[PDB]
Amino acid sequence: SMSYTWTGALITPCAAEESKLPNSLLRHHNMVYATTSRSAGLRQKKVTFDRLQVLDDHYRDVLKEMKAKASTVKAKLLSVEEACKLTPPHSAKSKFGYGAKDVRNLSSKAVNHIHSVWKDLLEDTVTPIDTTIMAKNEVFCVQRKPARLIVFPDLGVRVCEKMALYDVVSTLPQVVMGSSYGFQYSPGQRVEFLVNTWKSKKNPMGFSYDTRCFDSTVTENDIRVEESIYQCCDLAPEARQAIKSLTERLYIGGPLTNSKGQNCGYRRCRASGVLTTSCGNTLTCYLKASAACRAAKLQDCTMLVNGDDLVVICESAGTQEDAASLRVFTEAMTRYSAPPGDPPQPEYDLELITSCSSNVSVAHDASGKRVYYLTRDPTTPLARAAWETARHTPVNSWLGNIIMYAPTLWARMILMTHFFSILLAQEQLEKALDCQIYGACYSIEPLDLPQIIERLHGLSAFSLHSYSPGEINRVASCLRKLGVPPLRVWRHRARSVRARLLSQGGRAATCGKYLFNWAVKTKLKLTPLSSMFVAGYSGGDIYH
Ligand SMILES: Nc1ccc(C(F)(F)F)cn1
């Protein structure tokens, strides 16, 4: 069928939509835009097409292996109270007279409605369920992306999803997919694993695979298979019925309704704004790729899967033979309805492969020992940082990136300096800030950063020092390209900040001592002083 059909009703905004900055971070403010509903139509054209899916024996076999491992999982139902507590404070309200605030408080109005939505789930396993459709507001840098489409059901339903499936999507994928399951790794854990699986090959070859608009490529069959997998778990019988209902009424598809309550059409592919999205896309990606590997006689594959994002490291068969078996791999994925965006390409250097928007690089600690860490082209981070510092926003990408990319050259020299300067200037150091990690919302105290980083990256994070020439040129370039002060200018700014922080004692002094030792010249000695990287949840409406 078609991924979507349209009525012609517009995808409409809920509120005013900014698309540009209203400046000591970056000069070329021209280059930063936010996406808006103004670009919905273009995206609309890209995500809508027919899906032809041909299975084969490798598909059927990998699924059989997955269903066998899923049968070792036992999963419990979540009480209303637990499901309510997982709902973010600012999650979109219900069209039935209550908001997340009422949900979090166990207001008897929200809970009663939630009871009725659940009851109706058990009784009716057919009637499609209403979804809202929305263009996202996401900041990027020039050289333009159409806004992504987000699709999500009413708050009431979302809470039922949690009850029915939070335990499953938190617990199953790991067991089903073992070490391929990306969201069980912190960044140092992910580097360590990529690097070890690369050293483990006699003659290694790697390649990422970009599936073109993955959410569209997911078929209604795919979503029933995925259900068939959940069902292999030892479930409560009420969980079993709600899961059949949710999938048949919502996951499989349904009507799309814009912010003004008009009907935009009907979806027959993955909704992005549901609980099963990450888990769904990760299982569906692992299954197709694991099978595509077999079709292409790829020798000795290890995979890493994070939703629609896929890395494969295997034994090379020769550079010709490689290029070729990769084309077969692609044919297989295409048959399975996951055709390519960029066409995939072999790499014989781990450092050259990008996955989850990231790549492995290396530097050196105090002792000169070499250290691998995860980094990325810092353009979108800096872009969003400029946005976040200009317009006030609920989301703080900067902090997320400081946490994820603490070891990187750019996060230490630029993000850390910049934002500790603002916080010191605003006397807002003590305040918790919300940020996204593998799609879940965590409240974090910026002064905790040092221990957080020590815990997730090791102490070497505070003293890495001979960054690769490629990495240094990527940063410098991005700075010039963007109009951000070169790295030497941050060094001077950091000494100033480090100093102010040191003067305040307590945890600020630790922030200054640790975060900015790289900037001093004569170094201080840096001695020693989380259920966060377990599962993926973007679009799952989760808070911890
Ligand atoms: N040519 C490059 C480009 C980037 C990198 C690193 F930053 F990822 F290390 C290495 N070599």
Residue numbers in the entry: 1 to 22, 28 to 148, 154 to 539, 548 to 562
Paper text:
In this study, we presented a ligand-observed MS approach for high-throughput screen of a 384-member fragment library as well as reliable estimation of binding affinity of each fragment hit. Similar to other nucleotide polymerases, the domain distribution of apo HCV NS5B polymerase bears an anatomical resemblance to a right hand with subdomains representing the fingers, thumb and palm. Structural and mechanistic studies of NS5B have indicated the existence of multiple allosteric binding domains including palm I, II and III pockets and thumb I and II sites targeted by reported inhibitors. The proposed discovery pipeline combining our MS-based approach and other biophysical techniques resulted in identification and validation of ten new fragments bound to two distinctive domains of NS5B, among which five were successfully translated to X-ray structures of fragment-bound complexes valuable for structure-based design of potent inhibitors.
To characterize the binding modes of the fragments studied, they were soaked in NS5B crystals to obtain the protein complex X-ray structures. Fragment 162 binds NS5B in a small cavity of the thumb pocket, with its trifluoromethyl moiety extending a key hydrogen bond with Asn369 as well as making hydrophobic interactions with Ser371 and Glu481. To our knowledge, the three residues constitute a new active domain in the thumb region never disclosed before.
